[PDB]
């Protein structure tokens, strides 16, 4: 439209309206010129002594928008206002918009950089609606709209790993190359704006409630069962039985079973550091799966377990999600202690899921004769059994919203190990890059031009989601537990910028606070 | 099914067929069933017409894909065709997974 | 329909109606069970010392109907009545019909064969309408409806050669196998009948007239030309000219040129046998083309030549079509003298085409200086030149009607070297076979059954073509030449059965009798 | 054309383009044309959209045909794709004659 006329406004709010809440977030982004407008074949061999780190892929000159973290849509006070009052929620719509673009031309002429703004330069933008490109948004990768609205962020570079050969850095005949210029983009100059809308498929609500009943204590503790149980054998080998009394839950007949489990190791946090074994490189002793002759660590393991038992300091670290209070810089290989790290705890599920560092149970190892005695054998892993129930991992303010389910054809219970909603058709990926502008060419050459003017672009992005809520209707009498701002001797305010202007976040707020009778 | 294919609750009905029996020369009553039959056999044609639904491939892959091709070297005979005696030959098992898709 | 009810009648006649003639022919055929209902991969290596005789292909259990010879539609008296009165003709329609089928079951039980008729057996029949199968009808192959209506004929077996490798009996990766059961046939029991209709594309008429003017004598022999011609050089090197007088056709300026030519060798027929060189194996000294490293004899050479010069006994045998008076048996490798052979002569074209055993002309071999003298060099082959005219080979009563033009994409003047009409979509091929009936099988076996009851089938086939004629309108005064029954001291009647009942045909009747001023 | 393609009497028009010249600082008349120009260059985008007509193959060949396939062995790079530096690679010349037809 016009140079001296704004393309859009800054909308950033929330609007609770009964069983729906619409959130809105605007942010300023900056897009570098990655790979000097080229495609490069990136590849790696086995690093760290693990050929699972060996890949082969392509880095493109595009950047993408990632809105896959909760704190990109919710403020800490609107999150709290949700987890204290509702039993669940699920996304219903999405509507992204890019506007107020500005392309800047950088020039380092004379060992001195001068930033002037180009008014005729464009920016390319397209959304992958049919899922024809490798999805990279739902894998816990950095680069999402910052948590704090004032913060400006750089868009991350698009790239993807494709099939490599024999755990090496070479390709196979099936390795594919996707050209992103082969998609119909839209071009934008300073006066234009891009819009895009989407609507989620039905997905089941997330359950933001914790159970207030043990799964193996569902029976009435006053009435006895009309069922008997084999208790022992007499001297005559004759089998004897005994009735299941009331309150004796160790012996009652059950109807439902806890869910899957896979033992991990447990490590004690600070308080008990003394107990933990000294100097142990976990890699060698971690839970790992093999895929094509390579060993990959499967953190955070499949759903159906609790990393900790409420009341203890021991932790199943490989079944845990570990974030970082203070954001970090790319390429950091520094070793950090637990202090500035937010170890999430899923213990409000202990009533239904099993601890990840204990044996799942015991079963029989043989057959008793007039000779051999009955023997039991504890097991460390048990998968899904018919009639089992479990609770899924919880979502955090600083955690991921959705994940894309791989379209292989067959899958069981599509719920991402990192929490969130599993989707067959998740929000499209929105790529963007700066259309290249050639330097001073002066003669023909069937060779492509490699001299480009260095540029970068800035702009705003507004993303407005709509969520559906599930009202809590409990007849609990006494008061419940809520998420509260409980600090002692505060030297700073949490979820707010400190003296220098850097945003602080010392807590990981989850979602399971309210309760429900199993 | 562990052997591949489509698992069905109500698969194509089974079609049975037999030659109605024709008794030999019986000449007297006997409450015992007749066991002398004329030997016969039957011949005929069977046409089966199926309809299939296909899922079109829409990939934005740039480089070329892998295809199933008739790649033989120094062929002494043509595959999937009858040999000198008239016996049908088939030296390959053609599967179905050739095209690709970004997971 | 019914067993005791005829499927069709016997129509066999001709019906002249102005500019159209409709012919009709019915015949009785017999179909053996070829290849015991199987497909066999037939192949040959280099035979006769020529790797061009090495092929690789497939023989099928099918037989086909071939109506590609003129004497399958015309009687000798209706042919004559055509070539004496019209200037040309071309086919317009076709309509085949098969009926009165009868399958017979042969049994050699007890060293004694008993032919009984099976009333439930079928016969399969389909026409290749899209030209998806190898066409084999237009290649001068035996097996066409006999010339004489009373004669019963066996249908020939279908088969085809496909790509072979390095002039050997092995296949290439491109060798194709066509399954004929993979076409939708129609099944017929004794009471059924098959019908099929077709209509030819526009094709140019055949020209059944001979020119009554030499191509190089088209000018008026009374008036002179207003053009001059370089005749010689004076002692001063000065060039001299002279006017083109009247009647001096050796020197007139011409406008049109004779057509293509390729010298073959000429051999004298009987009368001059003495002149011919003694004992010569032609293969080594014949006109041959190379295709993929193999030498093939190109008889009868491309159109545009006359095998003989009217008034002489010399013959360009490789540019000639040679038929046989008395039909022969399959596999005969006997050497025959000219006697019972009908050597066609294309001399009624000598006014426009060049003799095939003379040099086509002379041209210049150098450049004359004050030193070198002018030299000429006779040429033996000259192809198409702009502004050339020629006449195509003639058709015979015992010769082919059409040919299929190969669908390669590029071709020049599509007229078959053997005469007839070149067609892009010729009359479909009509295949037929006896549906197999299994012997006494008694147990399962995933192996196909190989025991079959021996059977054969008989029936009638009526083919009715429609032709278009081109009326002759000449203002010639004196009488023309006609085809006449001119025999002397006839010991038998030609074109009629002899004492034993065998049909005789001592002449090859062509088509060029009438004349036309060039 | 000896080099392949379609011969046309009226082929797609030629599209020419140039940068209109802008004079330098002239300061006086001269019936002589100006030769001092400001150096410039232009950039832009060009979209070309063609429509093609295809001829469907309808063969009754039984055995399998030959196809163009991505048949490489021990690939050190992917063909028809950019290499480490960003330069596009193309090691094959793909033609057009793969399917067959009975002459």
Question: Kindly, what is the distance between the CA atoms of the first and last residues of chain A, rounded to a whole number of angstroms?
Answer: 59 Å
Could you tell me the strand content of chain A as a percent range? 25-35%
Q: Regarding quaternary structure, how should these chains be classified? A: part of a larger assembly
Roughly how many Å is the radius of gyration of chain A?
A: 28 Å
Q: Give the largest interface pair and sizes.
A: A-D, 23 and 18 residues
Q: How is the biggest beta sheet of chain A arranged?
A: 8 strands, mixed
Q: Treating each run of at least 4 consecutive H or I residues as one helix, how many helices of chain A?
A: 1
Q: Helicity range of the residues of chain A?
A: under 10%
Description:
This is part of a larger assembly, with 4 copies of chain A. With 518 residues, the first copy, chain A, is an all-beta fold. Chain A is built from 1 helix and 34 strands. In chain A, strand 32 (496-497) and strand 33 form a beta hairpin. The longest helix of chain A has 8 residues, at 76-83. Chains in contact: A-B, A-D, B-C, B-D, C-D. Chains A, C: Residues 1-489 form the Coat protein VP1/VP2 Parvovirus domain.
Q: What brief labels describe this structure?
A:
virion (chains A, C); globular; 518 residues; 4 chains; part of a larger assembly; eight-stranded mixed β-sheet; six-stranded antiparallel β-sheet; mainly beta; capsid protein (chains A, C); structural molecule activity (chains A, C)
